[PDB]
Design a protein around this ligand. Structure first.
Ligand SMILES: OC[C@H]1C[C@@H]2N[C@@H]2[C@@H](O[C@H]2O[C@H](CO)[C@@H](O)[C@H](O)[C@H]2O)[C@@H]1O
Length: 349
């Protein structure tokens, strides 16, 4: 078919599976959340908590689906239909190495729901405690062993793909052991080889040698807030793509519709980026496409704490908070606008 409605399998949408309900999980997990102290605000802060009641959740926005469980198969069905509306072919799943049966069950439910709609799943490896290249190798082996034969498990040209959040927390000399073909614990030329996409943060003088010396296959930028880092400044993307092409690396810039996290980080207002009825999203997605990249990542499907979500949100005013909403646009506007941009990306590819 040539309908301009099919999924794009070079479009990755960052997905969070950490939401709970009392009924399914025993607690409205993540809808309830600690308020972060001000890192510049001195001693004796008791910033408190957001209780995750219907009236008071840990977001400046409010989900159309309410305080949902990430383990609810009926919610997962609805999320996969939203990925189909957005034309986002890859769900990039946050992964925290919880080593608990509830994580294992939830990952299997997500893979099962994804496959019914031809959506693919890859893992976004988070900075879990004592993360190092040896336990990363063990965890890559475990994820490929457990999920590699699942029909929804993502591959690009025969290789799994992992995003590595805060990859700079690990020295290039350690990465080399995992990611150089000669490394002491290499995955290259093994059953467990993968495209490893590291997080480009700061200036080229730091990041270029880091990416080369660590033997990453590519890099992404994550942050939805323009200008937060060098990497999340879209005017740098043409030059970052030029360097990527010259050095055989895959650049996957991250685009988002806005940013606001002041319910959980009240001191962080300088990072707010206003959605302006979709104009912010349009500008950032246009910059990614114009850079001439092979793949794009979206921050985020559902990081509700950071206000980067494309998941439908509804107007809500409670006795405790007046939520932001998608203003002059309908709740599914960011899903249908994502589909528009996926079409422009494919026209460019
Ligand atoms: O997926 C990458 C990051 C996306 C988002 N900034 C958060 C990071 O997680 C931290 O902050 C969360 C609240 O926004 C908090 O719930 C979590 O426990 C933190 O690790 C992600 O690492």
């Amino acid at each position: 078919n040539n309908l301009g409605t099919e999924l794009d399998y070079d479009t990755f949408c960052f997905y969070y599976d950490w939401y709970g309900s009392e009924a399914i999980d025993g607690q409205y997990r993540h809808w309830a959340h600690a308020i972060a102290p001000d890192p510049n605000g001195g001693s004796g802060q008791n910033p408190g908590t957001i209780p995750g009641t219907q009236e008071s959740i840990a977001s400046n926005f409010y989900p159309q689906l309410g305080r949902y469980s990430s383990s609810d198969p009926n919610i997962l069905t609805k999320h996969m239909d939203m990925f189909v509306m957005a034309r986002t072919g890859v769900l990039a799943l946050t992964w925290w190495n919880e080593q608990d049966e509830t994580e294992a069950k939830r990952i299997g439910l997500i893979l099962d729901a994804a496959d019914k709609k031809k959506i693919k799943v890859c893992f976004h490896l988070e900075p879990y405690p004592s993360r190092n290249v040896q336990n990363l190798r063990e965890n890559i082996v475990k994820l490929i062993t457990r999920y590699g034969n699942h029909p929804a498990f993502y591959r690009k040209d025969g290789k799994p793909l992992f995003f590595i959040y805060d990859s700079y927390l690990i020295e290039p000399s350690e990465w080399e052991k995992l990611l150089s073909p000669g490394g002491s614990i290499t995955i290259r030329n093994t059953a467990y080889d993968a495209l490893m996409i590291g997080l480009w943060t700061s200036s080229p003088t730091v990041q270029r040698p880091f990416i080369l010396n660590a033997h990453f296959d590519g890099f992404y930028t994550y942050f939805a807030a323009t200008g937060f880092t060098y990497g999340s400044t879209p005017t740098n993307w043409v030059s970052m793509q030029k360097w990527a092409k010259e050095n055989g690396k895959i650049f996957i810039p991250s685009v988002g519709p806005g940013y606001i996290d002041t319910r959980i980080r009240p001191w962080n207002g300088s990072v707010i980026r206003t959605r302006t009825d979709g104009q912010y999203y349009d500008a950032m997605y246009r910059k990614a496409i114009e850079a001439g990249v092979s793949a794009i990542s979206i921050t985020s499907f559902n990081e509700w704490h950071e206000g980067s979500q494309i998941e439908p949100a509804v107007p809500y005013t409670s006795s405790e908070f007046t939520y932001l909403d998608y203003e002059n646009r309908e709740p599914d506007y960011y899903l249908t606008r994502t589909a528009y941009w996926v079409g422009k990306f494919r026209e460019s590819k």
